[PDB]
Amino acid sequence: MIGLTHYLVVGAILFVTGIFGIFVNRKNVIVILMSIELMLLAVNINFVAFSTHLGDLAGQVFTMFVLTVAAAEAAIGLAILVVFFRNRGTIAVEDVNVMKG
Amino acid sequence: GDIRKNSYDDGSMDALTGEQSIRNFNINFGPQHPAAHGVLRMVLELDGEIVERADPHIGLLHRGTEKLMESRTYLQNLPYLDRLDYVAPMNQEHAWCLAIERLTGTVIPRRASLIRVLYSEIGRILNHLMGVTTGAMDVGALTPPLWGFEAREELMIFYERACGARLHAAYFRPGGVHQDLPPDLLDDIEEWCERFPKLVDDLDTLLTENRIFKQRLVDIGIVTEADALDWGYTGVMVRGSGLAWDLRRSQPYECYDEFDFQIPVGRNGDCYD
Amino acid sequence: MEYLLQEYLPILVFLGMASALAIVLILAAAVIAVRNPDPEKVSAYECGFNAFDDARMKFDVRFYLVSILFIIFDLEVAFLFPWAVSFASLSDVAFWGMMVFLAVLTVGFAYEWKKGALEWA
Amino acid sequence: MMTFAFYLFAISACVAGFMVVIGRNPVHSVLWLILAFLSAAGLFVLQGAEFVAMLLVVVYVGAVAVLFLFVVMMLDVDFAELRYLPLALVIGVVLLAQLGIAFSGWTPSDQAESLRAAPVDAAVENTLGLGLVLYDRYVLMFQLAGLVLLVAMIGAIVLTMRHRKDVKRQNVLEQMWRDPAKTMELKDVKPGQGL
Amino acid sequence: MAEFWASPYGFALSMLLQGLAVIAFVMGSLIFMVYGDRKIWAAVQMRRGPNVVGPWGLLQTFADALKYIVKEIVIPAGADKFVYFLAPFLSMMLALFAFVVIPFDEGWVMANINVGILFIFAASSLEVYGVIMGGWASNSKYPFLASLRSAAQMISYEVSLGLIIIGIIISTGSMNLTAIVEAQRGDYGLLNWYWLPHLPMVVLFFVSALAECNRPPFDLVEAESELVAGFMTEYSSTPYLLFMAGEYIAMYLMCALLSLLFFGGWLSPVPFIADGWWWMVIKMWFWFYMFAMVKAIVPRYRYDQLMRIGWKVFLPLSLGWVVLVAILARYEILGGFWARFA
Amino acid sequence: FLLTTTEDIINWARNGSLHWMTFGLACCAVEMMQTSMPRYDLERFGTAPRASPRQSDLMIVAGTLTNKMAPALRKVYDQMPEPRYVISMGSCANGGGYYHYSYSVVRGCDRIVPVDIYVPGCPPTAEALLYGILQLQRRIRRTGTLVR
Amino acid sequence: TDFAQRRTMMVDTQVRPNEVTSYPVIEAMLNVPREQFVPESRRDVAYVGNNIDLAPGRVLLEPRTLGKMMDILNLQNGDLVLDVGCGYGYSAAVMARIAEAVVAVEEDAAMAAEAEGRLAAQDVFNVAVVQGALAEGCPGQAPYDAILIEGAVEQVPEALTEQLREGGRIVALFREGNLGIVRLGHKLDGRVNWRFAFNAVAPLLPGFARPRGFVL
Ligand code: SF4
Ligand SMILES: [Ca+2]
Question: What positions belong to coiled-coil segments (chain D)?
Fold first, then answer.
């Protein structure tokens, strides 16, 4: 029998996977952008799961706005990555390192 | 005249553009390529599909014609001319005959002169039908070649009825033309001429004012008078730029003086003109 | 839920069926046709001459900016589908709120167009 | 069965998500990512949130394709041969375990039912239900979302826009205005006459 | 048999039989679509087209299909082998899969879902991945160039595709495909169909459909004269057959959508003839005939010029139409000519 | 019987769907093109052009094969999946023709690829080529198997 | 003269299209000035697609021949290479940018001395020019990972192929009348096994002819 806990567990796994992708990636900033999308997908699973099991539409409304910000974030994330690639010639995570101390 | 290092309107210089270009996008365009005419190996350097360098490799159809000609008599060499610009073979035969006739100081009969003009203009239509309608096929129009090559088929039959060959006539000879035309052939050429403008209208209706056709040709390949003189341009390559140069008028040969025709010229010197 | 069973289970069933049909068609030649590979046959095609390189090099995408704007415009249109479905029940605020939303969209679109962002780099 | 449908989508999403972040091939990551979004859409349908299930696929099919464009635009020069992973896996496992313990005892507040702003109606289809609240009760958020999207439009253009000034360009409307009657004309060239 | 058809098994067999009916119709029509496509070009081209393989060439597609089944599969040495075989599979599978929600008559639909329009959009757009992944996975330059053009094509026709049909949803009040057809029922035959109140969007949808199907004037991912065969250059035998099958199935889906959204689906153009699946099929094949005629008469755009059409022509026009239709529907101008909802 | 009638079906499908690579070298290609034009309409036999060798069953060597071109012709032939058939069209491809004694010409395309049919002429007429293609179909019917 | 443009054009049109894919070779040929390694009288024709004559019977090989010759040797960063008949040292300079070190053997004291001067003037330091007979090689610094012979041969003497490491590669242009075949050899179990690589022509090196006497 599938209850709320089943969906929350899936959400937690995707969320930790997406967080994990950010702080283990070294070679590509686009894959970090993919991990951020995994992290936000996990959030929507929570909101949809809570919404349907409570019988409330707010969580589904919240999901639509999370998608809006996810789209805006991807657009800006790719734009910032474009200007970095032009200035550095690479998009490796290990190359975003000039400033330190 | 070198765009390999990209130049941007904001003056930006990318880090990679600074490095020396060792790993470029080079592609073999031909020989086995529908737009390459079978024997063109053009090496293209592309930058986001912008052509930055084009390096035609030719000779894939070099057959040593000029060497082979040195061990043959003048008559034995006449068929070699057919096979150079083989879309319109008798037009190429004409230069060989004219050169021999000039050196030998020979005058060809009047009827042979008229026949040479007749079949030279058949060749011009044979070529322009091929050029225009396969050019349309190069920009994606499937139908124009089918209509045009039906008219070519009829003209190739006029070739065969004059000499017995549809393409490589070997019909113009030093001293005139090999054989006289049957009277019924002249009737059929006249009948074909009455229909032909209708096909030209149909091709014009399909293509000339089509917006897609215009967007594929207008302002493409612009040639100025100065460009024409850089590269030895002749024919439509100069007339499209507005230079009313045509050897049939500027340096008349055969009996073209007594014919009535006009020279079309373009104003913009692009693919559309 | 009945709606799930009556309407969505057939989608899942047909997804498997269409997949089986496509897979069987690939396996038909894999099992019947003669296989005779050799180094020249399996080399990359570049019109009769060897390729200069493979297709794993950087390539400038001159429509990159339009593709970023494609992502944004995708979300804008998404907000219209629930509005269009609910059109009969919309209140005055719900109706004119969308008009304001679409007006803000058009200001962004007019900014892109005037800037030149719709012309390829 | 619902149990089979859940685990098909649940295992597909979780496995796909893992493959996105640990795989070495960025194009393979792109294809794993779209599988994760499709699997999550399957879960959304099972719960009766069909509109956001379908909206999610529509949005991320296009968005993931754009990601593929940037992967090949900025493809690394070492594709053929493309850390503290042990410690990282330990912190990830610890975080996942903590979340699992918190979800073991999950129970909503006893007031949660009475506080619902948009209670779901069995007789109303999901898309109609969302449309009844999205544009009236949440109208302020709806308008702010439009500005969030506008900021992305301005930012992307501000940050990146540039045009090559060394390539040949055509104005399409000027191409379509070219009059054949004006651009070509016949000339009466007399014999012997050059330019 | 009553004791049977009510069980899980009789329920399971019913779905499988319904699924075979869709595959039979779509694949059976594929025999005559490829034939009919070629016959139409030939007729416009003063020639016959296939006329020897079977009577009047009617068995030509069987010969073509069989030829590929006994043709060798060549796998490029440098290709990404899993993605190489996934690309043709997705191309054919997803195009066929979209037909699960297509209704052909009253109650003749495998899945009657509330979001049928969005599901169509989801499945058709995911089908493009077959072209993008097929070109890239081959690992050769011509398929690689076509792969980028395919991504460009998606960005060109999808930005306004949703807006083009939003008007029909406003008038109907539903995304259910059957509901859209019922909204076009009335006492004036074809004058109740949506082609009339949404005449501009019929043109915009048809053109967008051509681009979505990689059909001329938007056959840019193959583009023989520029790219040899585009994304299919390195594909042979049945994997290549699947790409062609998917191209025609996707075309057939657009013919269904054109007829459902704008020409009343299975409704009769005249009151005195009955409604039924025959009207749906007649309209589908008229629109296929339009697909074939266009291929015979138009040249090819540059793919940057296709993007101009989508963003600077279709996007402003479709957006303007949605606003106009909303005002006309909101105020019931012309007595609800644009407001068909109850 | 089963196997002979199976081969007959295979030979029927292969003859009725004989796709040829878009490959023309010289003035034999002009007549090859006329064979596909309305007067003859080669495609009405199911014999349609294909731009890519991966989708081609038939190569028509239509024109002179030079030494510089010979490796390119061999390569695209090697990239045809099997079965693959070759028609030699015209004197140059058949034996070198008018350029037989040249320093830069292959004296017959059968020095590079195996040939199934030779079509004589310089050029063969569009009808002569159509006859040659139908002789290839007779050859396949006579000797065709699953291998070729 | 803008020799840089001529050098780039030579690589683009004479090396890249001739199945030379090794980017180390393309990088090296884009950087080593060919005109600095030809006699002064040949400086303006340094980038022509033909063999340059250095001395009677000796040439600087055509760019296509050298590009393909180096591309198939497949030189590694840790390789020690024997370049037989280095002439003025152009080939040694190109290989020096890829291999660890090069031993360049030249037989004409005039060219050997010029090779040292020109190699130094280009700041090439992993190339040693050793003066002596070409057919002998340089057995003092053997074994070598790769051997490049820069002129046509009829036979490669055993003494020369013994200086090749097991698993080493030797590339030589063989002459059979008017026909020239570049072959690539691999040392296996002590025997060098030769295979066809491509067709190219050059004059015969002195000392590599075959024994040809009376035949009835
Ligand atoms: S055989 Fe004759 S017609 Fe054919 S290519 Fe050779 S010269 Fe031209
Ligand atoms: Ca550049």
Answer: none
